[PDB]
C-alpha cells in the first residue's frame, strides 16, 4: 500500500530492494549513475519528479517534428513571378503556411521547453557524468544549432539553404529510446548490406553490358539502349520491374526470340538476387536483435544484483532466512502471492535441506526473482480515488464493482457493440439509397456513442486510472471514446451549418474503430489464432521501425523541397511534355513539404515510381537528379522494408512456438 | 573393379550387400517390391536395362511437353473471315504451326514411346503389384486418353474443346520424380493456405465497404467507386499496389485529407497482411519439407537394413568379425579407405572391447554405414576406355594423366579463361565503334573455341565419361562446348550468307557463358562466400519448384487460348478503345500458345498486370472473365512465388551454419 517512487526515495532497505526488483520486472531501467552512488535519495527524487512529466516532453517533441508541415518553403521566400497566394498555379495547398510572427512564437516556445528538458538531467546525473556522455553532447549540439537558427531568424526580421528541419528531425530521433535502438541495429547491419550492394551492382553492370552489346544494331538498340549509360539505367529500372513490358517491347516486335533473354534476366534478377538480399538482411537483423536482447537482459541482471547488494548490509554476500521472509513479505505486499504462515517458512526451510543456517547467495536470488516474476501476475495499484474510503467501500459501490469485475459485464458490452454494428450497417445502407429516414438511425448512433462514454467512465472508475491505462486495448478505447465525446459536444454546441460536423456521418467511422475489438474474438477459433495474435502483437512492436522509416522520409522530403522546390509550374513549358502531365500526376510534386511527403510515400510502394525519376530528370536537365531517387530506392526499399519483412517473420515464428509451448 | 549393376544382378552376397549400400548412399532407391522378393535376380536385371535408357524417356517427355507450342490453335480451325495465313492481322507468329500430317506423325511416334515406357515396368514389378498402385493407374488413364484422342483425330481426317493439351502436361508432371515430390508438398500446404485466404478475403470485403460508404457523395465516388461491385474490384487491385496513384487521384484532387485513408489501407494491407501470408506459407513449407526428408531417410534406412539381412544368412541378427572384414574389403574396393593389415583388424577387436565373439547387431550396422559414407569420399569408376590397358598405361599417357590431375593444369584453364575475356571485350568494343578491323579479332575469337573442345576431350579422357559426368560443373561445360563445335562447323561447311551463323556474333555469348566459371573464384574471399555458394546451390535445387510454376503456366495458357482465342483482331472495333491499344500491348495477346506463355509471364512479375484484366473484360463483355486472372494471381503469386521466397531463405540459412561448422 506504498507507492513505488515513494518507496525508492524513502523507506527501509527492504522497501528499496522490493521497489528495485519491481522496476526491473516492469522493464523500466534507472540510470546507471544513480545506482552507482550511495543511497541515491535526492537524485532519485529529482529523477522521479522529472519522469512524471513524460507526456509533456513527448508532446513537445511531436509538436517540434510536425512544425515542418506548416513552415513556408524556402523557394517561396525568393521572389516568384506569380505570388504564392495563387495556390492553384503551383499545384499545392490544403495546409496553412505559418507567417513570420507565428513561426517565431512557435519556435521560441518549443525551444524553451526543449532547453529545459535537455538541461534538466544535469541535476541528478552530476556535472562530470553528464558532459562525458556522447548522447548529451550531441543533443546539446542540436539544441544550440536550433537556438542560433532562431536567433538569426529573429535578427533577420544571406542563406543558401536552411538547416533547421534536419536538426529537429535528428533531435526527435534522439528523443525516443526505440528510435535509438533501431539506429544501433542499422549501424550493425550496414557493413553486410554494403557487401551485398557491391555484388548486386556488379551483377547489374555485367547484365547491362551484355544487353547493350546484344542489341547494338537492333532497332530496339536505337530506340532505348542508345548508349551504355542509358542501357544501364533501363536495366536497373527493369530490375525494379516497375516497367517490364515497356522497356523491351521494340525488341519483341522486331523478333520474338529476344524475349527469352529478358525472361532470363528478370527471372534471375527477381527470384534469385532479391530473395538473397532479403535473406541476408534477415540474418543480419536476427543477429543484431539477439545482441540487443542480451544487452537488455544483462542490464536487468546488473541492477537486480545491485538491489541484492543493497539489502545485504553486511556486504559479505550473505542472506539469512529472516531477511528472505521479510523481503517475501514486502513483495507479497506489492505482488500477489500465496499467504505464508509464520511456522510455514520454517517448515519449508527445514524440509528443503538438512543444512543449518543455509546462505542464499546472489545468483540464485536473482534467478528466483525472475522465476517469481514470471510465474506470478502483477498486482494492481490499489486506487487513486480511494482517498475517500467510505464512498469506495459503500454497499452500492461494492455491488457495482463486483458486477463490473464479473465477465457478465464484458458479455453485455459485446452484445451492445454487436447491436451497434447492426445499426451502423442499417444506417449506411439507408444512406446508399438516399432514403429520408436517416435521422432516427443517426440519433440512435449518437446515443450508442453516449453508452460507450458511460461504460468507459464506469470501467475507469472501478479499475483505477493506472490499472485502466496499463492494458493496451484500454488506451485505444479511451482515445476513441474521448474523440467521440469531443466531436459530439462540438456538434451539439453549435447549431449551424458547419463544414464537417453538421453532416454527422463522421461518427460512424469512430464506432467502426470502437468495434475493431470484434476481431479479438477470432482468437477463440483454433484456425485463426496465430494470425490474429501475431497481428495484434505486431502493431505496437512494429511502431518503432515504421517511425524510423517515417523520419527517413522526412529527411528526404526536406532535401527534395530544398532542391526541386519550384520546378513544377502551371506555366512551365517543359513540364507538359513530361510523363507527369500525361498521367496527370501534377498534384504529387515537391513544391511544398506535405506534397513531398505524399510523393515520397508513392515512391515507397514502388508503384509507377520511375515516372517521377524520368520527369524530374527532364525537368532539371541534369542526370545527377536521378541520384536522389536512386538513393531513396537503395537505402529504403532494399534495406528498411526487407528489415520490416524480417521482423514480421520473426514475430510470427515467436507467436507460433509460444502457442505450441502453451499446449 | 566390378560394375555396380553387374554386382547386384550377379555375385556373392558380399557383392550384393556392398552394391546395395552403395546405391543407398548414392541416393538412388530401388523399388520396394524388388527388395521384398528373394534374391531379385531377373527383376533387377530388367530394372537396370530399363533405367539405362533414362535419357530416351526424358527426351520423349520433353518432346511431348513442347508439342503444344507448334500445335495449331483451335479457333483457327473454325472458319475465320480472313485466313490465318495472314499472320500480321491477328498479332501472332514466329513459330511454324504444325500441319495435320506432321502432327499425326509426331503424336504417333511420341505415343508409341510413351506407351512402351509406361508398360515396361510390369515386367519386374509383377501383375498384382503394378495394377494396385494409384500412380500406375493414373498414368495408364492419361495414356489411354491420349491414345483415344489420337485415334479419333486420325478418323476425323464435333468437339467443343480439345482435351489433349491438359493431359500431356499432367503426364509430364508425374513422369519426373522431382515434380511428383513438389505436388505432395502442395497438397499438405493447401489446408493451411485456405484458412488465411478466408481472413484475407474478409479484410478485402470490410475495407471495400468502408471506402464505398466514405466516398458515396464524393466526386471520386462517381468516377470509380460507382457501386460496391466496382469498389471491391478496385480495392483488390490496389492491394497489389499495381495502380497506387491512379485509383485514388480524383479523391486527392478534391481533398488532400483523403490520402490518409489510402495511405492507411496500403500500409496495413501490404506491410502487415501480405507479409503475414509469406510467414504462413514459409511455415507450412518448412513443416512439409521435414516430412519429405524424414520419409526419404526412412527409405534409405530400410534398404540398408535389407543388406544386413542379406549377408546374415543365419537370419538371427548376428554378424561376426570375420564376416565384417570380408564386407569391409568389398566397400574399400568401391570407396577409398585406409589399407588394413590382416593382423591389424584382429588387434582392432581386442583393444576395442574385452568381450569375446562380440555380435554386431542390426541397428549399429546402419548408423556406422553413414559414418563411413560422409567421412570418406567416393572412389571414381576406373574407366570406360581402359579396355586397352597398354594405351591406358603407356609412358606418354601416364605423364599426361599426371599433369591434368595436378592443379597446375587447372590454373592454366583459368589463365586461358581470363585471356579469352579480354579478347571478347576488345572485339565487342570495335563493333560499337564500327571499326573495319573487327574481323581479325573475330577469327582469333573462334580459335578460343577450338581450345575449349581440346581441353574438354583432354579432361574426359583422363577421368572417364562417368566420372566426368558426375560433377555438376562439368556437365554445364560439356553442353556449352558442344554447341560451340556444332555451331562452328555449320559456318565453315556453308560459305553462304546465312541469316544467323554468317554474322559470327553468336560465339561471344557462348564464350561469355563459358567464362562464368570465374565467378566461382569469388568464393575464396570471406565476404562473398555465403552469397555465391548459396546462389550456385540454388540453380539445381530450385529447378523442381520453378518447373512446377512453368507447368502451371502451361495449363492456364491452354485455358486462355481456348477461351480468348480470337478476341484480339486488327479489325476489332472495341479493341482500340481498350487499354491494350493505348499502351501498344497487342503483341501480348492470347491468340496462340507461344504468345500465351509470354503474356502469362508478364502477369507473373505483377508489372502492369491489370491492363490485361481490364482490357479482356471489355473485350469479352462478361465480368466472369476476371475469374481467370484473379484465380491466377491467388494460386500463383500468393502461394507458389511465396514458396520460392520461402525456399531461398531456407537454403541460405543452411549455408551459413554450414560455414560455421567447419571452423
Ligand atoms: Ca550478510
Ligand atoms: Ca451520404
Ligand atoms: Ca548370423
Ligand atoms: Ca554489330
Swiss-Prot record, chains A, B:
- Topology versus the membrane, per the UniProt entry? Multi-pass membrane protein
What are the GO cellular component annotations?
cytosol; Golgi apparatus; monoatomic ion channel complex; plant-type vacuole; plasma membrane; vacuolar membrane; vacuole
Spans traversing the lipid bilayer = 55-75, 104-124, 142-157, 158-176, 196-216, 260-280, 406-426, 443-463, 476-496, 506-523, 535-555, 629-649
Q: Regulation of activity: what does the record state?
A: Inhibited by Al(3+).
Question: Does the keyword Hydrolase belong to this entry?
Answer: no
Instruction: Please describe the organ and tissue distribution of this protein's expression.
Output: Ubiquitously expressed.
Q: Which residues lie on this side of the membrane: Vacuolar?
A: 76-103, 217-222, 238-259, 427-442, 497-505, 556-592, 608-628
Q: Which residues lie within the membrane without crossing it?
A: 223-237, 593-607
Description of how the protein assembles with itself and partners:
Homodimer.
- This protein is called Two pore calcium channel protein 1
Q: What is the lineage of its organism?
A: Eukaryota, Viridiplantae, Streptophyta, Embryophyta, Tracheophyta
Amino acid at each position: 500500500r506504498v507507492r513505488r517512487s515513494e518507496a525508492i526515495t524513502h523507506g527501509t532497505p527492504f522497501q528499496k530492494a522490493a521497489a528495485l526488483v519491481d522496476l526491473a520486472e516492469d522493464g523500466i531501467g534507472l540510470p546507471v549513475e544513480i545506482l552507482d552512488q550511495s543511497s541515491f535519495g535526492e537524485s532519485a527524487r529529482y529523477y522521479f519528479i522529472f519522469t512524471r512529466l513524460d507526456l509533456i516532453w513527448s508532446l513537445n517533441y511531436f509538436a517540434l517534428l510536425f512544425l515542418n508541415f506548416f513552415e513556408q518553403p524556402l523557394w517561396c521566400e525568393k521572389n516568384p513571378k506569380p505570388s504564392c497566394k495563387d495556390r492553384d498555379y503551383y499545384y499545392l495547398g490544403e495546409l496553412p503556411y505559418l507567417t513570420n510572427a507565428e513561426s517565431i512564437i512557435y519556435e521560441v516556445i518549443t525551444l524553451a521547453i526543449l532547453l529545459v528538458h535537455t538541461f534538466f538531467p544535469i541535476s541528478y546525473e552530476g556535472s562530470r557524468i553528464f558532459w562525458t556522455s556522447r548522447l548529451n553532447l550531441v543533443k546539446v549540439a542540436c539544441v544550440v544549432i536550433l537556438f542560433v537558427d532562431v536567433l538569426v531568424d529573429f535578427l533577420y526580421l544571406f542563406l543558401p539553404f536552411r538547416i533547421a528541419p534536419y536538426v529537429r528531425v535528428i533531435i526527435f530521433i534522439l528523443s525516443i529510446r526505440e528510435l535509438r535502438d533501431t539506429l544501433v541495429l542499422l549501424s550493425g547491419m550496414l557493413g553486410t548490406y554494403l557487401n551485398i550492394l557491391a555484388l548486386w551492382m556488379l551483377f547489374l553492370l555485367f547484365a547491362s553490358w551484355i544487353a547493350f552489346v546484344m542489341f547494338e544494331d537492333t532497332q530496339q538498340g536505337l530506340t532505348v539502349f542508345t548508349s551504355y549509360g542509358a542501357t544501364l539505367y533501363q536495366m536497373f529500372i527493369l530490375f525494379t520491374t516497375s516497367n517490364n513490358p515497356d522497356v523491351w517491347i521494340p525488341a519483341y516486335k522486331s523478333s520474338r526470340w529476344s524475349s527469352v533473354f529478358f525472361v532470363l534476366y528478370v527471372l534471375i534478377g527477381v527470384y534469385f538476387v532479391t530473395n538473397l538480399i532479403l535473406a541476408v538482411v534477415y540474418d543480419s537483423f536476427k543477429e543484431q536483435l539477439a545482441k540487443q536482447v542480451s544487452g537488455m537482459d544483462q542490464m536487468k541482471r546488473r541492477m537486480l544484483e545491485k538491489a541484492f547488494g543493497l539489502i545485504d548490509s553486511d556486504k559479505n554476500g550473505e542472506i539469512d532466512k529472516n531477511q528472505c521472509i521479510k523481503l517475501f513479505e514486502q513483495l507479497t505486499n506489492y505482488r500477489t502471492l500465496p499467504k505464508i504462515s509464520k511456522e510455514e517458512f520454517g517448515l519449508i526451510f527445514d524440509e528443503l535441506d538438512d543444512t543449518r543456517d543455509f546462505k542464499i547467495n546472489k545468483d540464485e536470488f536473482a534467478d528466483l526473482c525472475q522465476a517469481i516474476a514470471l510465474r506470478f501476475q502483477k498486482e494492481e495499484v490499489p486506487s487513486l480515488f480511494e482517498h475517500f474510503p467510505q464512498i469506495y467501500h459503500s454497499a452500492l459501490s461494492q455491488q457495482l464493482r463486483a458486477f463490473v469485475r464479473s465477465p457478465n459485464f464484458g458479455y453485455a458490452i459485446s452484445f451492445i457493440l454487436i447491436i451497434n454494428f447492426i445499426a451502423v450497417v442499417v444506417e449506411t445502407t439507408l444512406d446508399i439509397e438516399e432514403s429520408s429516414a436517416q435521422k432516427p438511425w443517426q440519433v440512435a448512433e449518437f446515443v450508442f456513442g453516449w453508452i460507450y462514454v458511460l461504460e468507459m467512465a464506469l470501467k475507469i472508475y472501478t479499475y483505477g486510472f493506472e490499472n485502466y491505462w496499463r492494458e493496451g486495448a484500454n488506451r485505444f478505447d479511451f482515445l476513441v471514446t474521448w474523440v467521440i465525446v469531443i466531436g459530439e459536444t462540438a456538434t451539439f454546441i453549435t447549431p449551424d451549418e458547419n463544414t464537417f460536423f453538421s453532416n454527422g456521418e463522421w461518427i460512424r467511422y469512430l464506432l467502426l474503430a470502437r468495434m475493431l475489438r470484434l476481431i479479438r474474438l477470432l482468437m477463440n477459433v483454433q484456425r485463426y489464432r496465430a494470425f490474429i495474435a501475431t497481428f495484434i502483437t505486431l502493431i505496437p512492436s512494429l511502431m518503432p521501425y515504421l517511425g524510423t522509416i517515417f523520419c527517413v522520409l522526412c529527411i528526404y522530403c526536406s532535401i527534395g523541397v530544398q532542391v526541386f522546390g519550384g520546378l513544377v509550374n502551371a506555366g512551365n513549358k517543359k513540364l507538359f511534355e513530361t510523363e507527369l502531365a500525361e498521367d496527370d500526376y501534377l498534384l504529387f510534386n515537391f513544391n511544398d513539404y506535405p506534397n513531398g511527403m505524399v510523393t515520397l510515400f508513392n515512391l515507397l510502394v514502388m508503384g509507377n515510381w520511375q515516372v517521377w525519376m524520368e520527369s524530374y530528370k527532364d525537368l532539371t536537365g541534369t542526370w545527377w537528379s536521378i541520384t536522389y531517387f536512386v538513393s531513396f530506392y537503395v537505402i529504403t526499399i532494399l534495406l528498411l522494408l526487407n528489415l520490416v519483412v524480417a521482423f514480421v517473420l520473426e514475430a510470427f515464428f515467436t507467436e507460433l512456438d509460444l502457442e505450441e509451448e502453451e499446449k
